[PDB]
Design a protein around this nucleic acid. Sequence first.
RNA 1: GGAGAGUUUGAUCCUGGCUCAGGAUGAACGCUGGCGGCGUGCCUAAUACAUGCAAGUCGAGCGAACGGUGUUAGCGGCGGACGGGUGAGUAACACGUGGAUAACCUACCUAUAAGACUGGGAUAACUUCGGGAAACCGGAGCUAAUACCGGAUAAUAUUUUGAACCGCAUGGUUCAAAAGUGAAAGACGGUCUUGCUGUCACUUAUAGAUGGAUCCGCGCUGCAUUAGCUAGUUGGUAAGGUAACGGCUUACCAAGGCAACGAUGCAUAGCCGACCUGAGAGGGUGAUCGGCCACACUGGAACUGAGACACGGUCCAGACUCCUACGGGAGGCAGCAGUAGGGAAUCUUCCGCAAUGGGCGAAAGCCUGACGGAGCAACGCCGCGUGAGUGAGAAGGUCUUCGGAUCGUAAAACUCUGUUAUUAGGGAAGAACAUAUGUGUAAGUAACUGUGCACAUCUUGACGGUACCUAAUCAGAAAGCCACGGCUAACUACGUGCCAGCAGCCGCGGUAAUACGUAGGUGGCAAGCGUUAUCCGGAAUUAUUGGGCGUAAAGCGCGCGUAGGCGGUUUUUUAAGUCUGAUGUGAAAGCCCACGGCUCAACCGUGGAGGGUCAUUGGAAACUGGA
Lengths: 74, 134, 89, 81
Amino acid sequence: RNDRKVYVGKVVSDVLVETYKTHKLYGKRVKYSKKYKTHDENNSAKLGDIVKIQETRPLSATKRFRLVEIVEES
Amino acid sequence: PTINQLVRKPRQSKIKKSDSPALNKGFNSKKKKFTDLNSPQKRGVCTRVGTMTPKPNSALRKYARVRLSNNIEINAYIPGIGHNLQEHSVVLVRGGRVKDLPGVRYHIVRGALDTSGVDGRRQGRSLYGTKKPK
Amino acid sequence: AVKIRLTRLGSKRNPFYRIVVADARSPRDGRIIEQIGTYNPTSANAPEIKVDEALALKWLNDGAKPTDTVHNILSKEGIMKKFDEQKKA
Amino acid sequence: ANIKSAIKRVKTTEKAEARNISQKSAMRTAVKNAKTAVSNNADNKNELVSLAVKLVDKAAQSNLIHSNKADRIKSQLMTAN
RNA sequence: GGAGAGUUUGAUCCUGGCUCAGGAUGAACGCUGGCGGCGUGCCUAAUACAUGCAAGUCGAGCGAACGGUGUUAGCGGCGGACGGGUGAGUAACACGUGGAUAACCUACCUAUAAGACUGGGAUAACUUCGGGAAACCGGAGCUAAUACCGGAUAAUAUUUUGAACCGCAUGGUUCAAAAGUGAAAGACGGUCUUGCUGUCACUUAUAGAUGGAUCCGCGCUGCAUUAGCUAGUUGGUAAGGUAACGGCUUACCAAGGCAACGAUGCAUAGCCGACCUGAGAGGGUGAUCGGCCACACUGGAACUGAGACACGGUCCAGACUCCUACGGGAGGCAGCAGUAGGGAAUCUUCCGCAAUGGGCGAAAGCCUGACGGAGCAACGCCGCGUGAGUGAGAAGGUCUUCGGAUCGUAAAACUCUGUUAUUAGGGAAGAACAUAUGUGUAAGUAACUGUGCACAUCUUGACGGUACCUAAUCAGAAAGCCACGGCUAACUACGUGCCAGCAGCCGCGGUAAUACGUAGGUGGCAAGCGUUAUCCGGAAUUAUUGGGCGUAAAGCGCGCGUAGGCGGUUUUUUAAGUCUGAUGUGAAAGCCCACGGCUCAACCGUGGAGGGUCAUUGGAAACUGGA
Ligand SMILES: [K+]
Ligand SMILES: [K+]
Ligand SMILES: [Mg+2]
Ligand SMILES: [Mg+2]
Ligand SMILES: [Mg+2]
Ligand SMILES: [Mg+2]
Ligand SMILES: [Mg+2]
Ligand SMILES: [Mg+2]
Ligand SMILES: [Mg+2]
Ligand SMILES: [Mg+2]
Ligand SMILES: [Mg+2]
Ligand SMILES: [Mg+2]
Ligand SMILES: [Mg+2]
Ligand SMILES: [Mg+2]
Ligand SMILES: [Mg+2]
Ligand SMILES: [Mg+2]
Ligand SMILES: [Mg+2]
Ligand SMILES: [Mg+2]
Ligand SMILES: [Mg+2]
Ligand SMILES: [Mg+2]
Ligand SMILES: [Mg+2]
Ligand SMILES: [Mg+2]
Ligand SMILES: [Mg+2]
Ligand SMILES: [Mg+2]
Ligand SMILES: [Mg+2]
Ligand SMILES: [Mg+2]
Ligand SMILES: [Mg+2]
Ligand SMILES: [Mg+2]
Ligand SMILES: [Mg+2]
Ligand SMILES: [Mg+2]
Ligand SMILES: [Mg+2]
Ligand SMILES: [Mg+2]
Ligand SMILES: [Mg+2]
Ligand SMILES: [Mg+2]
């Protein structure tokens, strides 16, 4: 078929997906994070859990991801 | 500084400033606002011709007071020996400050608009707006 | 519709043509789908036709239509005969 | 306005708009009537639904509505039927 | 593939700024000006626009009228959403790059299949009676269609029953198997049998192709002397809505959402390929060509349509302009020219559809300010001229230590040439076709006509009698600009006397000025040469490459401490960084290399290379990160 983007992150409100942005001029890696509002269905996950998410069609004004699996419990 | 300091606060180069600021501005009459255009010359009208004394040097250096087409007042030097300028003359003004004359940052173009060429000039005539003799 | 047509290159009084597959609405020298050859009508001896025969039949079988001059070019290279023979067979 | 074919297009647009308005109005009336008849289980709720389905399909053929909108309207009646 | 120099001192070494030598331009200005080729030419007022042209076409869909087979207005179809312009708005999924849609739409085109049955009623035109200055509007009748509308047949489309199999959650692909429901058109030909049949056209279904839409990762300017922002806001449920998912909209429920990783606000800006500069790392720009977006006097809408919320369409509101007979009417150059205005500054109210491309048409063809050409401008680049050979120190100018020196083999004189120029003679390519006419073949036919394919004949050039070529005649028409103290190539005389003037810097001029002005000579360039403006370089002068902080500018007065940055030794493990292959993609044009055509060169063309912090995927495990 085709593959949808997958991320792993920590719940910050019941997902933060911290990544690195290498500096264009100096070459140093700098940590940056982006919050991915995701769809949890039956409110299963809680704050601090490390979760896996997958990209979906728009679900609301800002939700574009579905929580597929919980990796590390809060 | 450290690499981390440079990442937090990158280098910043000094901003260059223009030696002829009155040439790099336009004026929209309809909107009564100033533009930024970088012209090489500007038309203007002579408000007050006259002379001024230099700063070691000693002379009576001829100049004119000009209101440029962008409604800015400048002091412009009149090069060459003799000129035909007076009040209400229409002149073309170019860049180039004259040392020893404080507050005169521009030159009047000889042989353009109402300014005549220098009379009797035979060497470097194109700098003084003089046609080729004979 | 989709056309097989000539886009102009070269310089003044010295035309050179690329043979392209393009949307009819695209500007003559603008966006194309795929180039399939060249055409030089001012060459010294031969008009220097350089058609990619496998590409031309794929687009002809996909509904692309040549302009009048491109039809003559494809005919001079036998592409029109192979197109008609493959359609019946 | 200025161009001869633009002037003619004003007339043909007005003629099409008048026909389209009538057919849209009739189609919407039958859909609303069929919707009400379901919410009360009338004896002829089947005839009113069949009429509404007939007109919605004719509007889609006339490009008055998209086929996707006709399908969405058709289902809403038929599930409730 | 990387150059420095001047300037702070009596002199020095540092530090440090300043200035200069280079390249470039949509340039402008001054002086000057021969030609050819190729390109480029409103950067300012998205200011206002006189006039002409920039979108039509189809009589083989239809009736009528006027003319003698033609044509006009009208109905109808298709086009007018392309092509062309502009960069105002926009800091945003607008754009670049990489993906996703199991949340999408798609006229014309192509292929396949099944069809194309049976009825009806309008109305423009038109005739007639009016009303209005006009724009135009009313009354009465009349009439056609591939216009419009009923009915029949057609399901893969919808509902329900389920089932099998599969995916990434919603789900998706089939298998059914019942119920509703949805079409269409003829024109011109052949054969004739009024039946069959060719082409184009029509309907439905399914694919392909094309075009469009939405979403997401990363990338995107300043200002913190801008720190709080949001209340459909953030999520949920339901309904409505859309091609489609969705606060897209509404109702109710909850109080979320964003932000120091810079929210928000203000300002600025269309973005990219590219372009200029630089050794590179970088810095600067978006005119021209190409891609994407946005806009069309300002603001708000919707209609038709496959597609528009539509530059040369409609409706409404506003500013402005124009006609009026005062009731009323009309308009939108950021299309091509052109005008006025603004400005330092940017062109013809040209020719043609011959070529390429586009719309309509069966075709002939018509339309096409796209486009192809011509005109103007040294605005740029490239090429060629303005003569060549021989010619011992003539005159004239300038200087002179009045011997001479120098302009100078320069001139004249003798011969020679004709690129150019003038006159005349010839004169390409760019043209491929289409149509028509013959034959042949393929499919189909009962057969033919026709259709596809092939060969042969026919017509067609705006530029333009242009390029080019040939002959004759004549050195005759065709050189200017800046500079010469040092940087920096090239010096003397006279005039002037801190005046007049020069000047990028150092500075020059106050009576013996190589710096002012002129003259002779010389230097540098040359149809150009200088000046100004602007950008990069020199500038290691924001220093990642590549700088500093005792006294030159620079260590917070000093603790405690949050975020962040960084972090000792070893083993196992992982695979985010790192390394190494594969695949896809990074358009075309451009730059660079190679080759080909232009007499050369510019330029043009062809084939490569390059350019990602790109994605996906297979390996490695030392280092950084995770366990
Ligand atoms: K000194
Ligand atoms: K044409
Ligand atoms: Mg030929
Ligand atoms: Mg030219
Ligand atoms: Mg402009
Ligand atoms: Mg205007
Ligand atoms: Mg007609
Ligand atoms: Mg069709
Ligand atoms: Mg019809
Ligand atoms: Mg702007
Ligand atoms: Mg450098
Ligand atoms: Mg519609
Ligand atoms: Mg339009
Ligand atoms: Mg217009
Ligand atoms: Mg115009
Ligand atoms: Mg003016
Ligand atoms: Mg054509
Ligand atoms: Mg016309
Ligand atoms: Mg000039
Ligand atoms: Mg020297
Ligand atoms: Mg001088
Ligand atoms: Mg003297
Ligand atoms: Mg000097
Ligand atoms: Mg001098
Ligand atoms: Mg030259
Ligand atoms: Mg610089
Ligand atoms: Mg510099
Ligand atoms: Mg330093
Ligand atoms: Mg220190
Ligand atoms: Mg001190
Ligand atoms: Mg100090
Ligand atoms: Mg201290
Ligand atoms: Mg202190
Ligand atoms: Mg060349």
